[PDB]
Design a protein around this ligand. Sequence first.
Ligand SMILES: [Zn+2]
Ligand SMILES: [Zn+2]
Ligand SMILES: [Zn+2]
Length: 572
Amino acid sequence: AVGACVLCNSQTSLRCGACIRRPFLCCKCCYDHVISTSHKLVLSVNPYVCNAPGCDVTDVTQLYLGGMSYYCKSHKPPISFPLCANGQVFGLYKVTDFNAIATCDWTNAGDYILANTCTERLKLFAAETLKATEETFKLSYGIATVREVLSDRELHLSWEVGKPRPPLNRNYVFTGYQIGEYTFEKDAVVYRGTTTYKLNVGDYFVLTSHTVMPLSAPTLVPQEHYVRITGLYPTLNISDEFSSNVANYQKVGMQKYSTLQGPPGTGKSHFAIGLALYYPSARIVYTACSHAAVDALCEKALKYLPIDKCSRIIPARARVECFDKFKVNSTLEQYVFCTVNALPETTADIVVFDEISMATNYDLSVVNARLRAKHYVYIGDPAQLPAPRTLLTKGTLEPEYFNSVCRLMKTIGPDMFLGTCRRCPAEIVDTVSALVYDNKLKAHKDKSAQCFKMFYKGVITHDVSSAINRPQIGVVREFLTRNPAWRKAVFISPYNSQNAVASKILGLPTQTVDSSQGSEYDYVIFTQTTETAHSCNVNRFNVAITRAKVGILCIMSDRDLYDKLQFTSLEI
Ligand SMILES: [Zn+2]
Ligand SMILES: [Zn+2]
Ligand SMILES: [Zn+2]
């Protein structure tokens, strides 16, 4: 039972038995917790429970010290000291925010606000408690027993009675049985097996209830500012391609960590890979939460960095297909590309963490715990999409609360800002600049005269809760006949069910706003589907329209965002 207090560090025998993570609490702060919350079970070497035979008193406020043993008011000896007295819980070696993190259900937005505005050790306790709460929540749903196999990609599932059914998006990876991870999409459901196997009828599926490991390292290491570039050696022969980031590559070597806010197409990948050409001798580890983000960094490194010193780290429990053009798992190559969850135990001169709005504080801590670097660079954009908070149902999570890095980028500002968008037609750049970047994002391209908006509410149908708007897809089909150049367009919408219906009717490649992040396409057709808080979220709206290089057609439901779009309006 030896350990240190998660609130003030004062070493103690005490742990909270009612807390799902069982934190070490000191005599002072343990009392301050048990007297203010429903949490009264206090654990030590031996728990704080009445030692009298057959007595079920476990509330520490109802217990006393019988010399060296513990008893309740009904069994205590004449000479007994109350366990809960004078602002202390008796133990060895002798809080409003801690109580609110320890007792919350993580369904409200204020829970996530507090998990980011609290002290650094409370940010880790909150990150640990949240991830554990998310995992024990998997046990809640019902099992899916296969009823019929249509083909190599299609099946019919039978669900467990009494227990609710989980959302069937690629976001929920069902570990199926021992055959491996499997995902689903809509009585005809499409089965996405990671490991190709003859899906037998009658087989069952149970959700991935993984174990939450304790957090040791902070979300952000303590900041350090240096007078000269430290441990890094720059080139004087530095390519003119990367000359626009030279002042910022120097800022990187003159701080322990630095933040870079890069709106869509402002050159984040270019900045990240150019940092390697500026410090050519430096060992750089490129990390991000998603495999697609690490893959986008791999594609940029393939064009500028020597392929022999690059290595793509893939966890042997390989979930889905990723970058195949580097040597796999050579954990010591100068340039290492790896997701946060697969990070090995190593050191680096620079660590680059990309798509920082997708990181949680749990991921921020894991990176600091597995990688020990001279320099840490956080690239991303708080005006883009955050990680899905699968328990959160009440309130909206603002960008300053995505993680510690976004919190800094939104309060004190980012250390570096990429201000020129080189991807989008000016109509899109002018719209998102005013919408999320306070007019500091400039357009490099001219207005393409290929950005259109149509105000069309249509008809909203629901496949469970994922929305469909067939009349909006019908408007797209009517537009495509008259504008056949748009045949090459990617169809984007805030819902998978809308995308599924549009893929059958239009035939265009389909992408949700969330999965479109980091990618770019010449033409984008976007149907807003509904006027919900999800389809109206300005960060998702920002991602959706900033995917287009040449043109975009937005069929809108919200008068607010339709009026804000600086596109040519269309009739019908
Ligand atoms: Zn304490
Ligand atoms: Zn507790
Ligand atoms: Zn008793």
